[PDB]
Amino acid sequence: MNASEFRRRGKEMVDYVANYMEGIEGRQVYPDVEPGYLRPLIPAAAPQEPDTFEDIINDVEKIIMPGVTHWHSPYFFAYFPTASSYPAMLADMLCGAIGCIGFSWAASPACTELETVMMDWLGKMLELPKAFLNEKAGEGGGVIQGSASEATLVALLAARTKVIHRLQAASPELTQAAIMEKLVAYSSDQAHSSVERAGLIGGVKLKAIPSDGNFAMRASALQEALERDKAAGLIPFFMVATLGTTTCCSFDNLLEVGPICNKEDIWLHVDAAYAGSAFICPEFRHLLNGVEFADSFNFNPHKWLLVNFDCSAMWVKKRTDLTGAFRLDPTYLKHSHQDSGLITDYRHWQIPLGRRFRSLKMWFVFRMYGVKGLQAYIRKHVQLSHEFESLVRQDPRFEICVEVILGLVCFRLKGSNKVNEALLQRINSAKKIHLVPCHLRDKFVLRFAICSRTVESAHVQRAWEHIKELAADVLRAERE
Amino acid sequence: MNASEFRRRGKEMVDYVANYMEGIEGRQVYPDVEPGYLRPLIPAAAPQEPDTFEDIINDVEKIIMPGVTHWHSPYFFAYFPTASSYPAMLADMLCGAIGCIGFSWAASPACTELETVMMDWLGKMLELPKAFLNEKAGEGGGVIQGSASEATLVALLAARTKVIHRLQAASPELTQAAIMEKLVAYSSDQAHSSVERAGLIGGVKLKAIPSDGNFAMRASALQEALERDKAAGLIPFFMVATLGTTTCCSFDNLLEVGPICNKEDIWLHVDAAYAGSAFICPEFRHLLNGVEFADSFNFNPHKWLLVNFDCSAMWVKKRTDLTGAFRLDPTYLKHSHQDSGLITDYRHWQIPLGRRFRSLKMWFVFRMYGVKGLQAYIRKHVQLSHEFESLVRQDPRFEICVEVILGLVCFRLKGSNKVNEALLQRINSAKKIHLVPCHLRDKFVLRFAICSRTVESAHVQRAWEHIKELAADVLRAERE
Numbered sequence: 008m009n010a011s012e013f014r015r016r017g018k019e020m021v022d023y024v025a026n027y028m029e030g031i032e033g034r035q036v037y038p039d040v041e042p043g044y045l046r047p048l049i050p051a052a053a054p055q056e057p058d059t060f061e062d063i064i065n066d067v068e069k070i071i072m073p074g075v076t077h078w079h080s081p082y083f084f085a086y087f088p089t090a091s092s093y094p095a096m097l098a099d100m101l102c103g104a105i106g107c108i109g110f111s112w113a114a115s116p117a118c119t120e121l122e123t124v125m126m127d128w129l130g131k132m133l134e135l136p137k138a139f140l141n142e143k144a145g146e147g148g149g150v151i152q153g154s155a156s157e158a159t160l161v162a163l164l165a166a167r168t169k170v171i172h173r174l175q176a177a178s179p180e181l182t183q184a185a186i187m188e189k190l191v192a193y194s195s196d197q198a199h200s201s202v203e204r205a206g207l208i209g210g211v212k213l214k215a216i217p218s219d220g221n222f223a224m225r226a227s228a229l230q231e232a233l234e235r236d237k238a239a240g241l242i243p244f245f246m247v248a249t250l251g252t253t254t255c256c257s258f259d260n261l262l263e264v265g266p267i268c269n270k271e272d273i274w275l276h277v278d279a280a281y282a283g284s285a286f287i288c289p290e291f292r293h294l295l296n297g298v299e300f301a302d303s304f305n306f307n308p309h310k311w312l313l314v315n316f317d318c319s320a321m322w323v324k325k326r327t328d329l330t331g332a333f334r335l336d337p338t339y340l341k342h343s344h345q346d347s348g349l350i351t352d353y354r355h356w357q358i359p360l361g362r363r364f365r366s367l368k369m370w371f372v373f374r375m376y377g378v379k380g381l382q383a384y385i386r387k388h389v390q391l392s393h394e395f396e397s398l399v400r401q402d403p404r405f406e407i408c409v410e411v412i413l414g415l416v417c418f419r420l421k422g423s424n425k426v427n428e429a430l431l432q433r434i435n436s437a438k439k440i441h442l443v444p445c446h447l448r449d450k451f452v453l454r455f456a457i458c459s460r461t462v463e464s465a466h467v468q469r470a471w472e473h474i475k476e477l478a479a480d481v482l483r484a485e486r487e
Numbered sequence: 488m489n490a491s492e493f494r495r496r497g498k499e500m501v502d503y504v505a506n507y508m509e510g511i512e513g514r515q516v517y518p519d520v521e522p523g524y525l526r527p528l529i530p531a532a533a534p535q536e537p538d539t540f541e542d543i544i545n546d547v548e549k550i551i552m553p554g555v556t557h558w559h560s561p562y563f564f565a566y567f568p569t570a571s572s573y574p575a576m577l578a579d580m581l582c583g584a585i586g587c588i589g590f591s592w593a594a595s596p597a598c599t600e601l602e603t604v605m606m607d608w609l610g611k612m613l614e615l616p617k618a619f620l621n622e623k624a625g626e627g628g629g630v631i632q633g634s635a636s637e638a639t640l641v642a643l644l645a646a647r648t649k650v651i652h653r654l655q656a657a658s659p660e661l662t663q664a665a666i667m668e669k670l671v672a673y674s675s676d677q678a679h680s681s682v683e684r685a686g687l688i689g690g691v692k693l694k695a696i697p698s699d700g701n702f703a704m705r706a707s708a709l710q711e712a713l714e715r716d717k718a719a720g721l722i723p724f725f726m727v728a729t730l731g732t733t734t735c736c737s738f739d740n741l742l743e744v745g746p747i748c749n750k751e752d753i754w755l756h757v758d759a760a761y762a763g764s765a766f767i768c769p770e771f772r773h774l775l776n777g778v779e780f781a782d783s784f785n786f787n788p789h790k791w792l793l794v795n796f797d798c799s800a801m802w803v804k805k806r807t808d809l810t811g812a813f814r815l816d817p818t819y820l821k822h823s824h825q826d827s828g829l830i831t832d833y834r835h836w837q838i839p840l841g842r843r844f845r846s847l848k849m850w851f852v853f854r855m856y857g858v859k860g861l862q863a864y865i866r867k868h869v870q871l872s873h874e875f876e877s878l879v880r881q882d883p884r885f886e887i888c889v890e891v892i893l894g895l896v897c898f899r900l901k902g903s904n905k906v907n908e909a910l911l912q913r914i915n916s917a918k919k920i921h922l923v924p925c926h927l928r929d930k931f932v933l934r935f936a937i938c939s940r941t942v943e944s945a946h947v948q949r950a951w952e953h954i955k956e957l958a959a960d961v962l963r964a965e966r967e
């Protein structure tokens with residue numbers, strides 16, 4: 008295809024995207040397809056001769072769309088929100104056009120330099136401590152990561168490298184493997200699965216700290232675990248404190264855990280993938296207090312800040328902890344400005360080497376929406392979460408398991424876990440709304456998450472009507 | 488922004504992208520900016536109120552474009568090509584529109600099911616052994632990875648998990664750390680920096696196998712290294728054989744190394760990031776012979792197959808080696824069809840959890856170009872590489888260090904490394920063309936890579952004229 012053909016087809020794809028978004032409420036949020044639906048509907052081999060764009064866009068509606076779970080339908084209340092903003096889509100078109108692979112500054116200076124300033128913009132929006140900000144002064148800085156799971160793994164690998172060199176400095180004969188056998192990392196019992204995967208990838212032991220009644224990590228439980236493990240020969244090195252847990256959007260206490268991790272020389276990484284976007288609002292910034300004790304902080308703008316996937320923002324106190332570890336400098340990836348402190352090569356900050364101009368999406372979203380526009384988007388979602396909470400609190404057959412703060416409501420029918428599992432099956436079978444469950448201790452709990460950018464008060468009210476209607480049918484069958 | 492506004496601005500961005508591509512030859516391939524250029528040109532904080540789209544697109548030309556190294560200019564001959572095709576750009580617009588985070592099949596069935604069939608399409612285009620193909624039969628399958636560096640790390644982590652369980656099965660008292668101390672992996676001395684980073688991340692020792700006169704790994708050198716290391720207590724477990732090396736596009740011998748790795752129970756991963764795209768042409772498929780002995784194979788369609796970054800294709804013989812390792816099954820990521828063999832959850836195949844609908848780009852590129860269209864794109868680039876080779880072979884002042892096969896020419900002025908380093912400095916200072924160097928043993932060697940999709944015979948001829956003119960100036964200064 009040439010450019011003149013892309014002018015026509017590209018503007019047609021713009022119309023198809025806008026039409027799909029304007030009629031997404033007419034779409035069923037969850038598909039009716041069964042596993043293995045797509046392969047019988049398309050040929051087994053690639054076409055030797057070119058197919059037409061009209062046949063491809065027809066196959067999108069006929070084959071692809073039926074097997075699509077619409078994350079951006081207003082009736083999608085599953086997991087956590089994912090970002091869909093038109094400014095980010097416009098920037099992705101320019102990003103693919105420039106087509107730069109910015110592993111180094113020489114690969115494309117604008118790709119690296121725009122990312123560093125955008126991380127300052129975001130850091131100042133969240134009112135982060137100045138130690139995390141690279142304002143052409145200071146040892147800290149930020150980087151776009153592909154995912155919060157990758158950012159957690161990168162933080163663990165940097166902590167593992169630092170503790171190995173410290174222990175080998177004290178005991179030069181100590182081998183790395185013997186250190187690895189005693190290394191232990193910590194997380195909450197409400198932590199995301201990325202923490203355990205990172206520990207399994209890093210070859211280190213991971214232990215879960217018991218949470219309190221509010222499902223938050225406290226200083227007492229951490230001190231009890233450190234007391235047991237250090238007496239057993241284990242060397243704590245890494246800690247993941249979670250703000251806005253996947254289960255119930257609970258918040259670990261950084262003011263209690265932070266100072267403990269600093270005394271114990273434990274690297275403190277803060278995982279606030281979902282809740283981090285709300286910290287640009289001053290009413291929720293108090294939940295971030297204690298990040299000054301953290302060595303690394305990460306949140307996902309591709310969740311609740313309208314910067315389409317992929318975009319994960321990660322700041323560090325000392326860049327040399329990241330740039331010094333896993334450092335390779337091949338001649339084919341060398342340039343003359345590598346030693347300049349004004350810039351950097353983000354390849355050392357990430358597991359991959361290649362990377363794209365993702366900072367254009369942050370630039371576009373921040374400028375076209377503004378800080379006040381993003382703050383209004385956050386507050387409308389939290390207001391809608393409290394509106395769903397009010398409806399549940401008006402029915403004595405239901406109960407709210409955890410305090411509602413930032414767009415997630417954990418609710419359940421009072422009684423067995425079987426009656427709540429039956430209600431979820433009825434909901435997902437009707438396919439009018441989409442919700443996902445969680446397990447708080449031994450309790451089966453349903454989750455209601457405000458996700459879509461176009462969600463309104465009407466959609467939440469209709470979803471509660473659907474849940475209340477199915478609850479009576481399920482509660483009736485329990486009495487028979 | 489709403490959809491009606493995106494209709495206008497989106498079609499304007501289509502025009503800007505097409506205009507940039509049609510006038511990319513008027514752009515200087517390498518920027519004249521210095522490090523730290525971008526921060527003084529934009530505000531230090533995000534705008535509280537929204538900025539206009541006209542001011543943003545103006546800042547793209549005024550600020551962003553001067554700091555852009557144009558990978559898709561015909562005069563870009565640096566590193567290796569990166570993919571820029573309009574069909575992939577159209578699919579990326581639809582991918583961001585659907586906005587699915589397909590960590591599971593329930594997240595969006597079409598995202599996972601289309602990817603599995605596209606990997607079969609590609610595998611059959613490369614005429615891969617049927618063991619790597621998931622055609623709803625067999626234990627093998629393919630997955631899109633974010634990068635070849637990530638695919639190499641994933642293969643090493645799966646090999647590390649398998650060797651640990653085998654050794655612990657033979658010796659139940661053996662701890663993992665003691666096994667890690669003896670684990671050693673292997674690669675060529677011409678291997679990419681991703682192999683060493685993967686070994687550093689995996690906490691295992693990595694050793695380089697000496698290459699022959701053609702810079703290829705041979706059975707004799709591998710047997711000598713295995714003989715030394717196994718006598719020293721080291722346990723070989725992982726091997727990365729490279730097809731199309733970053734340095735000189737050399738090809739390791741899989742027919743020699745493969746059977747050795749199978750006897751030694753060494754996981755064999757094949758890294759063919761750049762050269763893998765040419766294997767869809769039957770004249771180059773002989774270079775892939777021996778992949779039948781490999782446990783994993785990876786190549787980058789985001790290099791030489793017009794599928795824009797990111798897209799890395801990785802096949803495996805046994806999916807359970809990947810899906811079994813680092814397996815986590817939280818209730819919030821559970822669905823009812825997880826146990827179906829007709830589908831899968833690609834989250835276990837990758838370091839991250841989230842992923843986007845990247846298989847749309849493979850679908851669009853394969854259908855709009857066709858197999859014959861992609862084969863013609865490969866052969867035109869190889870023809871242009873042989874044309875540059877012919878020009879160098881007509882000048883006795885120059886020499887070709889390695890055989891030219893698949894789009895890369897390694898050349899240098901006969902004599903010192905200082906005269907070739909001076910020639911490269913003159914070339915990159917003139918900014919008319921962009922080339923990068925490499926080191927073959929102790930020899931400084933310049934590289935010429937056919938990169939742009941719009942490159943023609945005229946561009947290569949003008950680049951050789953520029954190199955020949957600067958060579959005489961540099962050779963003159965050496966005699967003074």
Ligand SMILES: COC(=O)[C@@H](Cc1ccc(O)c(O)c1)NCc1c(COP(=O)(O)O)cnc(C)c1O
Pocket residue numbers: 086087088089090153154155156157199201249251252253278279280281307309310316319588819820839840841842
């Ligand atoms: C809530 O369910 C979880 O599995 C994820 C789902 C999810 C939601 C939205 C996006 O965009 C997404 O990528 C994943 N919320 C996850 C989560 C992660 C996972 O980070 P990445 O998906 O790897 O970026 C990490 N930490 C926390 C606290 C999470 O909730």
Ligand SMILES: COC(=O)[C@@H](Cc1ccc(O)c(O)c1)NCc1c(COP(=O)(O)O)cnc(C)c1O
Pocket residue numbers: 108339340359360361362566567568569570633634635636637679681729731732733758759760761787789790796799
């Ligand atoms: C040739 O220089 C190398 O650093 C890379 C550069 C490069 C070129 C094009 C794209 O798209 C790119 O992402 C990187 N060629 C690299 C290379 C890799 C790196 O894989 P990823 O960049 O992580 O996908 C791996 N293996 C080989 C053999 C390479 O040549």
